[PDB]
């Protein structure tokens, strides 16, 4: 075993947030638990979350983490006999561009839903007497679109509050920027303050390599012997489902090939439609792994 | 004695970590005591240690050392009559690239071995309600591969814990980096917090120059005068071993020459195989020093 | 080399035996040790083939500080200690400057 | 197989822009998707595109392409482990005569 | 020894790339290891490599080599005690005339294999929204065809990528040119980024002079004393082979002269056909060196 083998470096596991969006929801919104849709695994934002829009490129988004802890020191022990970690405080800050209601509500710690535009559309937003403690649910989701198979990496912060506001500079060659720092708090119902997520087909290519779950070694077609009616109806067509030994649905990632296309027609997705009666073999190919199913068609 | 002779400068003793890898193991792993394999001296990582993969080039890896000490001051003494050094605190930090399970477990102070990928491969990693005190065993091993004889310089830290986490910045032209600072703690069983190691044939060229042990002046062939059977069997072949006065095995670094190749065949590694009966002399040459052995072959 | 590593790790490594293949492991001591050294800093100004040797004698020095060690793939490893001079009673000084 | 067969040079695939015209349209115009007429394959310019007319022969028309990219550098790797190309900037310049 | 003898100038070792071709292959192609056919030493391009066609004569082809290195400076040492060379960057640029699919795919960093010509043959090639990192395998092979014995000088670059595109100028008296700069990258599988090769009978005349291998001093006929049946069959004809002391097959470079043509006929290639039974001598002569063999023909 040489040095390179020991290093076991995986360049594909480096993920770049080529695009990024911040979504805020009012505290009454049900918090997101995952961004992966249970239907097809696509990106699914729960209702109530609204994007803040464009933010400054060069500032980007900075995520902060600090630990406050206390060491229990015993006589004659150079190192603490016990370290008590109180909490982990997560913050994130960014420079928003868009002058929309949710951004301004965040900046001024106020609810502006009752603000009615004037008879010519003008609005005036008064800062409240006392700044209010307003909590939001936050999603920070980024995309690494590589080889047409995107990776969505995201952070879920169910309870965030405005913590700090950077100085706002007006220049005649720049747009106005709002630069809040948001602090994450633990939400009791969901039981965490920050969660990090990975999703997307590009991630599905990497989950086993990243060390989550087990690797894919066998492909299984759950409708092993389906039957499709020649005549039109509910049972005329059948949708296949290809899984693995690790329990991951690999149906989008496989190539569907039929034995006799005339007898039973299968699409790229894997929907088997029986044009004519007979027997057809449907083979799903992904790399060197193969799952084969046989379909009987009746008229 | 001129200035140059007094300086006694050895450029070859300057070692460059041209490549570097960080390996972490769960605290239940048996700690590494050496990276040098007892079989052939090759680099040998104990099971349970896993590389974190690629890390940032420009940041590199920074090793910190802090001494905390107290001085006992006596009346009329400008200098302390006694200095009590409590401990030496060793830290190291680096910027990891790969979104692997072990890296994310380190940064979030959590065990994610029970995290199951969703049907489409997505994972959500929740930060624990309270950060946990998790210890790891760490190996930092670097390679100076020069003249095709590598030097492995390494640090063994049997008990490391996450101490600090640098701010994480998301930029649309960069990958996401994790920048932990790890603090070494004394492991009671192995009896140290940090150990520095050197290994490899390139190091073996330099051990005497570096002042460890004594210099090599004589070469000895430990088998001496063996006998190999012409017929095929367990005792048909004999493996030689070449040592020095300092007790260092120099077998990989010597040139094996046989007197009569037909009588007894010797490879580069020094394995004597008796093709035909007779008397053959096997000479191992390294630089200006040599060792001669005579092998009698019987049929 | 051994003397540099002994200085940085505040340990005596004279008993460290290289392994069968020459490898060595240097463990940091459980408690850092107070180790004193005698130091000579001698420089040379070679001008017109008639050199000048300027030197400092520090009979009792001890490791005082160790700077952060950075590993870069385009540089050699550096050890950056700060040594503090102490008065040696027998010779009666902590620092002497010499010219020869 | 000799060198000439391997080279497989096709002189007829070298195309000389003997005549050239630049047409501009206001942004409200529907963009052209192809210049080939679907009926008989002849040249078909969509409405709204207007030629700028004659331009200087010697200057010709210059087409520029620049890439902006950032290299991700890992420790111990001489070459980047990933190159992020931001965009490809295309420019063209020419010297118009007509007022 | 005079100055002329010391200089030892060999004009025939100067090679002019009178003709030159650039072949590109998709990264999925198996990289070329050599261009010399193992059968008869002729020039052999692996499948998947396609020539870009004609390129501009005056610009030619330019090969660049850049070293990046760092010097380790020690106090009191005017020169570095160690120089760490990171890599050698090889580039090449040339100006292509032909508006082929592979050329346009290269310049636009896109795959155009799915582009379908319209009903009248027209094609539209859209530049991708984001430029893609596409690697190719490259062969630059030139020919010096002098004295009817060609020399093939070539460069193998298994992993090349578009690095730069020069300004494209449209003129009414010139064809349109594409001027890419390609950068060679190290291919892990084959273990290099650039390899330079020499092949051909003209090279074979110069291999010993160029200092590779040893000089040719003896010619040897490997078959020795063969026997051919007069009757037609599989064993009716035997193909000879002439070698040298350096291990180079000199069969194309030798002249076959038979003793009795009626007994055994030998062609220029050295194929021995026994027309009538008897004993014949086959002599292959090259310059002042010769090799003789005797063939016994039976009916």
């Amino acid at each position: 075993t040489d040095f390179y083998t020991i290093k076991d470096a995986q360049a594909d596991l480096a993920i770049a947030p080529l695009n990024l969006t911040v979504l805020l929801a009012p505290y009454s919104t049900t918090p997101a638990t995952t961004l992966e849709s249970p239907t097809d695994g696509s990106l699914a934002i729960p209702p109530g979350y609204k994007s803040v829009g464009h933010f400054e490129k060069q500032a980007g988004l900075t995520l902060g983490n600090e630990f406050d802890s206390k060491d229990i020191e015993a006589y004659g022990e150079p190192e603490p006999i016990r370290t008590i970690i109180n909490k982990r405080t997560t913050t994130f800050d960014f420079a928003m561009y868009q002058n929309q209601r949710n951004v301004l509500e965040l900046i001024w710690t106020q609810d502006f839903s009752n603000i009615q535009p004037s008879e010519f559309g003008g609005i005036v937003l008064e800062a409240p007497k006392v700044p209010k403690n307003i909590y939001y649910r936050a999603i920070l989701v980024g995309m690494d679109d590589r080889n047409d198979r995107p990776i969505w990496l995201y952070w879920l912060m169910p309870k965030v509050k405005l913590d700090k506001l950077d100085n706002q500079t007006l220049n005649d060659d720049n747009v106005i920027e709002y630069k809040p720092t948001l602090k994450a708090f633990r939400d009791d119902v969901v039981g965490y303050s920050v969660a990090q997520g990975f999703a997307g087909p590009g991630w599905r290519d990497l989950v086993a390599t990243a060390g989550f779950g087990e690797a894919l070694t066998a492909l299984t077609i759950t409708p092993g012997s389906p039957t499709v009616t020649v005549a039109t109806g509910a049972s005329h067509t059948a949708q296949l489902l290809v899984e693995g030994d690790n329990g991951i649905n690999y149906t989008p990632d496989v190539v569907f090939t039929s034995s006799a296309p005339d007898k039973a027609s299968v699409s790229a997705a894997g929907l088997v439609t029986g044009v004519a009666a007979g027997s057809a073999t449907i083979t799903a190919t992904k790399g060197a792994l193969t799952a084969t199913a046989t379909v009987t068609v009746t008229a």
Side-chain angles (χ1 to χ4, degrees), chain A residues 16 31 37 58 68-69 89 101 106 111 114 135 198 223 243 278-279 287:
Chain A
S37 170
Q58 292 305 316
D68 55 343
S69 69
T89 301
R101 176 156 71 74
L106 172 68
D111 185 274
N114 74 323
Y135 292 103
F198 302 85
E243 267 192 45
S279 80

Side-chain angles (χ1 to χ4, degrees), chain A residues 48-60:
Chain A
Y49 284 90
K50 190 186 189 299
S51 165
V52 299
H54 279 314
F55 47 100
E56 161 71 42
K57 172 197 292 285
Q58 292 305 316

